[PDB]
Amino acid sequence: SELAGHQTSAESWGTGRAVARIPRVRGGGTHRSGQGAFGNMCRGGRMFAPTKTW
Amino acid sequence: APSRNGMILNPHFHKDWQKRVRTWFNQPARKIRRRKARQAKARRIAPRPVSGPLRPVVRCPTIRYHTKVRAGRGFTLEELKAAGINKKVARTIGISVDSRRRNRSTESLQANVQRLKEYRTKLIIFPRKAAKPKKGDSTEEELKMATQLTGPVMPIKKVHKKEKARVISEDEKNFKAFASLRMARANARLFGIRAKR
Amino acid sequence: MKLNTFVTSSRRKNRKRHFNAPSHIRRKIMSSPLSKELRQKYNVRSMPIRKDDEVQVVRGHYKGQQIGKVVQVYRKKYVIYIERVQREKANGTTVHVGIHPSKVVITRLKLDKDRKKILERK
Amino acid sequence: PTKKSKTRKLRGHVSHGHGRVGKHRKHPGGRGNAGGLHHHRINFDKYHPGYFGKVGMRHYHLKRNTTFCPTINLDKLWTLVSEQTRVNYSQKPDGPAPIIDVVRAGYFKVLGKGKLPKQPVIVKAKFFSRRAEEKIKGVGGACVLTA
RNA sequence: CACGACCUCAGCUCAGACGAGAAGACCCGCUGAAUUUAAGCAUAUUACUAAGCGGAGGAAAAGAAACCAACCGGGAUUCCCCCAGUAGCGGCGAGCGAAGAGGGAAAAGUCCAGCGCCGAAUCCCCGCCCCAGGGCGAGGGACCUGUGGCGUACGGAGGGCCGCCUCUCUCGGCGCGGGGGCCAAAGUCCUUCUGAUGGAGGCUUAGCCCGCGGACGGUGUGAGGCCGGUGUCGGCCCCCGCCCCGCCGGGGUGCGGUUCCUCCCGGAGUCGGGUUGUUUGGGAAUGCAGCCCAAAGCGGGUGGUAAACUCCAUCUAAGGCUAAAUACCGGCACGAGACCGAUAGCGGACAAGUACCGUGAGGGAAAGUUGAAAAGAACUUUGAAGAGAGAGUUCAACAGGGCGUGAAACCGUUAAGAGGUAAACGGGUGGGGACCGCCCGCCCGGUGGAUUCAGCCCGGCGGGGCGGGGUCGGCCCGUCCGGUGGCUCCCUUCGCGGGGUUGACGCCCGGGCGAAGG
RNA sequence: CCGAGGUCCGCGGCGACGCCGGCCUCCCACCCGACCCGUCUUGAAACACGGACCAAGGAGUCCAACGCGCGCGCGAGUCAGAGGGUGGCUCGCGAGCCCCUGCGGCGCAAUGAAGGUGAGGGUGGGAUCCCCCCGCCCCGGCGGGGGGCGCACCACCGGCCCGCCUCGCGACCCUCCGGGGGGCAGGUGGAGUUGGAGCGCGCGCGAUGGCACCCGAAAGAUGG
RNA sequence: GACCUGGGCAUAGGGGCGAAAGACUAAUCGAACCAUCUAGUAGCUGGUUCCCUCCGAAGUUUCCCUCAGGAUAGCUGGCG
RNA sequence: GCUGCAAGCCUCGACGAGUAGGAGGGCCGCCGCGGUGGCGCCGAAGCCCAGGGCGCGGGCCCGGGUGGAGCCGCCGCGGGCGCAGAUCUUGGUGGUAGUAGCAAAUAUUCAAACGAGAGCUUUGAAGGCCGAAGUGGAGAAGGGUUCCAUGUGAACAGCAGUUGAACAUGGGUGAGCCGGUCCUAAGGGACGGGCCUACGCCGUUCGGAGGGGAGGGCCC
RNA sequence: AACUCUUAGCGGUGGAUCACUCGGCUCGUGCGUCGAUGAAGAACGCAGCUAGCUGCGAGAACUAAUGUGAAUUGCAGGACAGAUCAUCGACCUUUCGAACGCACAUUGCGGCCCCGGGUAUCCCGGGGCCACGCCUGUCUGAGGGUCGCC
Ligand SMILES: [Mg+2]
Ligand SMILES: [Mg+2]
Ligand SMILES: [Mg+2]
Ligand SMILES: [Mg+2]
Ligand SMILES: [Mg+2]
Ligand SMILES: [Mg+2]
Ligand SMILES: [Mg+2]
Ligand SMILES: [Mg+2]
Ligand SMILES: [Mg+2]
Ligand SMILES: [Mg+2]
Ligand SMILES: [Mg+2]
Ligand SMILES: [Mg+2]
Ligand SMILES: [Mg+2]
Ligand SMILES: [Mg+2]
Ligand SMILES: [Mg+2]
Ligand SMILES: [Mg+2]
Ligand SMILES: [Mg+2]
Ligand SMILES: [Mg+2]
Ligand SMILES: [Mg+2]
Ligand SMILES: [Mg+2]
Ligand SMILES: [Mg+2]
Ligand SMILES: [Mg+2]
Ligand SMILES: [Mg+2]
Ligand SMILES: [Mg+2]
Ligand SMILES: [Mg+2]
Ligand SMILES: [Mg+2]
Ligand SMILES: [Mg+2]
Ligand SMILES: [Mg+2]
Ligand SMILES: [Mg+2]
Ligand SMILES: [Mg+2]
Ligand SMILES: [Mg+2]
Ligand SMILES: [Mg+2]
Ligand SMILES: [Mg+2]
Ligand SMILES: [Mg+2]
Ligand SMILES: [Mg+2]
Ligand SMILES: [Mg+2]
Ligand SMILES: [Mg+2]
Ligand SMILES: [Mg+2]
Ligand SMILES: [Mg+2]
Ligand SMILES: [Mg+2]
Ligand SMILES: [Mg+2]
Ligand SMILES: [Mg+2]
Ligand SMILES: [Mg+2]
Ligand SMILES: [Mg+2]
Ligand SMILES: [Mg+2]
Ligand SMILES: [Mg+2]
Ligand SMILES: [Mg+2]
Ligand SMILES: [Mg+2]
Ligand SMILES: [Mg+2]
Ligand SMILES: [Mg+2]
Ligand SMILES: [Mg+2]
Ligand SMILES: [Mg+2]
Ligand SMILES: [Mg+2]
Ligand SMILES: [Mg+2]
Ligand SMILES: [Mg+2]
Ligand SMILES: [Mg+2]
Ligand SMILES: [Mg+2]
Ligand SMILES: [Mg+2]
Ligand SMILES: [Mg+2]
Ligand SMILES: [Mg+2]
């Protein structure tokens, strides 16, 4: 799917925190908050070079 | 970006082209779809040809397709008048008509009038009621031997007629072909400057 | 070989409509073969099993010539219960063991106003 | 495919064939034809002279069917007819000459590049070069014009 | 100065209808950015995109030429291919970028206003009469400030002359597919194995049996024959439709040809011009819009360079309708897969847009698996109870309930050894430990026991060949001659579909030829 | 046998695990060597950064177009693309097969802004091959000595085509109003020519446009 | 007393409000938050995953609003 | 005699460092496909091993244990195909570590009861504190059953618990005169009109033919 | 001794791996249907034992009809056993919502007609209504706007 891994409104926390400068999911009271969302190395993210149908 | 000798490429991929990408995965499916539509149409017009009305023979416009004929849009009103076919009865018997086309020469006119006459002989018209065969309707013998015509109705023949080998006349050998064209080009340019005299 | 493209041949679909089949369809699924004497008398291969049929287990642990009687057709579990096809629980209570209808053979049919109608069509 | 790909033999090598000092980054010299006049000028001037600037008049509504003039040389002139036709009239050089209508074959102008076999021939074309005609006249035959 | 007609404008919970919102993938009308590229950046690009607003339909839009073209001319629209990364646009930088023709899919054309004829010949409402189809009312209105018929650029109408003659629409009645139910072939044969067979072997050596069914699934393991199905436009049953033909019935009304007469023939604040902004490849201005100007009628538009004169070509703008080819990440119902296989694949295989978070717009998880069958551990016993020990179920509790397999990190314990230079590591060896590991053949000489016993002969059969079987014979293919004889021939000359001459033409026929083969 | 690199036609004690064998790997010990990897860097064991440990995931891709090399088909052609046909009630098979009077693309002609015009071998080197002569022959060749046709390719010299320039300007049969020619020659410009090599498919790689190997800004914009 | 304070109200993001501190505007203010454009760009840090075999560099030239980068030549490899 | 997988085999000579980088070979490894050759309940995959080995290596084979239903070789084909690093992602687990810590507002003690179990519950007594700007008694907002009875003592209440605002099972909020409801305050917001391409916006007692009610019996 | 480290067995911790898959993703095909006759969405309610999900709407875990032909199942109980399931043309379908008398942090505040009851009056209950824009028509009107008649 073209939307796979990009259904998140993730913004990188930037530097200043011990986190690794990856787009992390917006805050909340869930386990999903603060997790990598977009990169291919992140769980639940977008695969590298998603297989296109064309 | 340029590394060594090569073309200066210009890939037109600076827009959001991924949003507009049409894949031809249904191309063999539309072939089955368009084929079923012709077969479905063929049964709806079972006696009539499936390709549609008879198309005229027209000449392609430009000089690039000078010697090329082509199935036209419809027969000129002058071509129907010279063939004894009324304007509003040609559509009823499967004859394509368009009033925009004109006949600038008799070669194109006589070519389609013969095509209209050749069609009306090969045309088998069924009576409106089988119990009442009228004048223009065909005979009861030709109605049984009347099947649906597949393919284009009277395809256009491209007669590759060859000029017979003649004996070259001495007057024909003295014709300066390069000078004739070179004079025609020069006289066509100095035509307006000569008319001022 | 399936020549009808409108019928699916798919592990994902054939199993979905099997475990989620309606009760009236599970009746046809939970069919059982007839005995060679009934198959010769009624000229019918198999039949959807009912409650009061006398069957005989052919496969599994309870196979044998003992002709029992179906207790209930647990259509939800795709299993039937027979009279003497049972098991003792820990507390000594006897519980029926579920057998699939494809593992039994109908030795006697429960004939009623509707069973004879279906046997005639087959 | 990916079996014979170069990336399959770059597994384990850190920089992946792009150097440690100068890494592989995002367009280190601009995107596309950037800097064609400033920092890629040497490449543009060495391999594409004439790339910058204007030359010649402009033709707004150019229709390629107006300037359509396919040409053919005399060495391929007899290819428009069968080989048996060229041989049959070789034994009869006393006036019966074949006609090669170049217009119906798909060409307009006749150019006199190759040599013509010693046979009289009537060539029908829309245009003729000076040398193509004189080679047809010299070998025997006329150059008929057509529109 | 009331009473009437009209005009204009009101009121109603008047009579009867319509609109609203949703959805919005595809479609139409607007609006509109900036990241980005130009290695900066301002025009440009991004992009006439995202977001925003309005409006639809199963498609929409478009559409029957104020077109293309410049040719021997094409001929509504839409879509595909090509045109073409071309003409051209562009700090002529980055970049951008169509169209005519050509080839295809699909093709279907038409209605007004105006012009002027017809006694408004027209429509609606109401109240009805007969069979959705036809009528009626000295009922009420609409309408002459214009309804209907005829008629629209292809010319049209009317009157003469000439010729052929009346045929659509909608209902009843006999003849020419779709949908839903139900049913339809054959092993639970023999032996063995397994917790379970769906495993193995066999079933005159036609695997035994079916086969137009050996797709798939289920069933305790790999099932064509156990079951559902599968294959058979096979059978039965119930709904339902299209088209053609025939009769009866209500509404239908003739049309063509005229080197003949007469008459009529058109879309104004629109075109066009100027200007401004925007848009376009359109460049002295492609399209659109604002403001100003403001038309003409052998006129007007276009002819890709502004202008005047002139000729030619083409169309007839400023009103309307129109299927089919085309699109469809939404919806409804299906099929499929060289896809993913529970950190993967949709966020969601599960009470997933759920729990939960934020005032809110919104953010948004984790989480699949006992077993074939709960057979889910009776009962005994210690303990207040969790938790245990027995017993018991199961092929298995090395399957006991977040229970299949159960890795690594980490930890307990046991066994073993070591430890004052942090531990590990390379090379060499030592010790220890845990588990393992380990004379025949040919020929010949004698020896003593057995040779459905050897050479050779006979009989039957089979097989073998260019370092060379020989002699007769056909066959196949390639090739070359013999034309040995007529069909295409050569688009080959002759009279108007017939005849006469020749090409390594094919088929036929005899001979050659090739280590070309059987 | 001081000879084309080793054999014994010499032999002993133990052989059924007690007393035999097991390189490496396990434990332990000793000697020698030995600083922690990755990364940027002239220079890392660094008082440079990242890394407590383990599992799983995790980064050169796909598309378009181009270049060169290679494989393949055919060849001055090549590719059939849109489409069409049809084993007919269409599984496998949205494959494959077939024909499109091959539309067109790219080649077969270049050159000029354009109007336009438009392409006739020599020398040297040269794989290979040809011929002759003298010896030898195991009749198949070998050896020696000489000549020649010369592939591809290269160097040079020409011819020709288009642009431009200069010079030569003339009388003449194509002028038919107008006009077209008039060895022109000598130079020079060209992505030309003087016996085509391309087209299609596939593969590899390189440089590109795209999210473009992956992760990363401070921002900017639109709507709320 | 220019006092303190509840509730109801009003002002909304380049806007508000400010006895003025660039203060405050929901723990966010020298321009709030949310979603989208957006996987924004980065000549800049970081990382870039199996083995063996062979060959093997450059930090120099010229140009560049270049000097943490490119183009270019050289050096390199492969194919011949 | 042996070979002759000619992509094989054999002979001879020289040579061998390597970052960035390039090329080649792989009977190295992973997932799926077309073929082909198999394997499997007499036990596949995976996992574990002080067992036996092979390869320079990537890796592989075999044995044993566990496991319980699928799997592999070869010739081709297609990749989301190989990790130690990215202050990587997700999940898990360590050392630190039985460590920091459970130290704001003076206070507890005796006995008894229930109970398996008591510093903490309950009862009584004793001694103290809040000291009426309460550590008291009632509301508003907010919470939403937290209220009450009974039972339970798993989890939670950072020790305990016989206790609880925990859990389980039931029960409980009764209005003409308490409040809402009625009124308009600031204000919000229709209507007329205007604006806006539009969704809409502006505006608020003004601005429209904005009255729907009469008395009197058809009239003001 | 302990402690520490290494090695293996066993037991934990933990969850990988593998096998499984009623799920996703992608492509193709046929249809291509919402709403004032009250939509989408929302709220509340509905089961013998029922929280969620799902299905329904006071006829509430389904009614009728048709097809089907013996079950549903966790436990019962009970089938007027034609059970159940499917289809789905009849019927039903609370409140909010374009939401429509005015409103709404209110189950708030009104008006009209009709019916029933207490007794036209009032009170109570029930039924049908009362939004905005607009079209055709009717009805009732307005203005010396333009006239006619006087
Ligand atoms: Mg830290
Ligand atoms: Mg994902
Ligand atoms: Mg480069
Ligand atoms: Mg069967
Ligand atoms: Mg390297
Ligand atoms: Mg690097
Ligand atoms: Mg590289
Ligand atoms: Mg550098
Ligand atoms: Mg790049
Ligand atoms: Mg709407
Ligand atoms: Mg920039
Ligand atoms: Mg930049
Ligand atoms: Mg910038
Ligand atoms: Mg948008
Ligand atoms: Mg619709
Ligand atoms: Mg359509
Ligand atoms: Mg339309
Ligand atoms: Mg553009
Ligand atoms: Mg065209
Ligand atoms: Mg017209
Ligand atoms: Mg099966
Ligand atoms: Mg623009
Ligand atoms: Mg002009
Ligand atoms: Mg229209
Ligand atoms: Mg998931
Ligand atoms: Mg989904
Ligand atoms: Mg087991
Ligand atoms: Mg187990
Ligand atoms: Mg387990
Ligand atoms: Mg241990
Ligand atoms: Mg010890
Ligand atoms: Mg070992
Ligand atoms: Mg570094
Ligand atoms: Mg330094
Ligand atoms: Mg130091
Ligand atoms: Mg650190
Ligand atoms: Mg991994
Ligand atoms: Mg290159
Ligand atoms: Mg071609
Ligand atoms: Mg091209
Ligand atoms: Mg030469
Ligand atoms: Mg900016
Ligand atoms: Mg306050
Ligand atoms: Mg702001
Ligand atoms: Mg300051
Ligand atoms: Mg990226
Ligand atoms: Mg650096
Ligand atoms: Mg080396
Ligand atoms: Mg994969
Ligand atoms: Mg080990
Ligand atoms: Mg990967
Ligand atoms: Mg790791
Ligand atoms: Mg309660
Ligand atoms: Mg506690
Ligand atoms: Mg208690
Ligand atoms: Mg309490
Ligand atoms: Mg509670
Ligand atoms: Mg070690
Ligand atoms: Mg363990
Ligand atoms: Mg409703």
From Swiss-Prot, chain B:
Question: What is the organism field in this record?
Answer: Danio rerio
Tell me, in a sentence or two, what this protein's role is: Component of the ribosome, a large ribonucleoprotein complex responsible for the synthesis of proteins in the cell. The small ribosomal subunit (SSU) binds messenger RNAs (mRNAs) and translates the encoded message by selecting cognate aminoacyl-transfer RNA (tRNA) molecules. The large subunit (LSU) contains the ribosomal catalytic site termed the peptidyl transferase center (PTC), which catalyzes the formation of peptide bonds, thereby polymerizing the amino acids delivered by tRNAs into a polypeptide chain.
By which gene is this protein encoded? rpl13
Molecular function terms, GO-annotated: RNA binding; structural constituent of ribosome
Q: Which family does it belong to?
A: Belongs to the eukaryotic ribosomal protein eL13 family.
Pfam families, alphabetized: Ribosomal_L13e (PF01294)
Provide GO CC annotations from the record.
cytosolic large ribosomal subunit
Record PROSITE patterns = RIBOSOMAL_L13E
Instruction: Give the location in the cell.
Output: Cytoplasm
* Keyword hit for Transmembrane: no
**Sorted alphabetically, which PANTHER family does this protein's record hold?**
60S RIBOSOMAL PROTEIN L13 (PTHR11722), LARGE RIBOSOMAL SUBUNIT PROTEIN EL13 (PTHR11722:SF0)
Q: What is the lineage of its organism?
A: Eukaryota, Metazoa, Chordata, Craniata, Vertebrata
Name recorded for this polypeptide: Large ribosomal subunit protein eL13
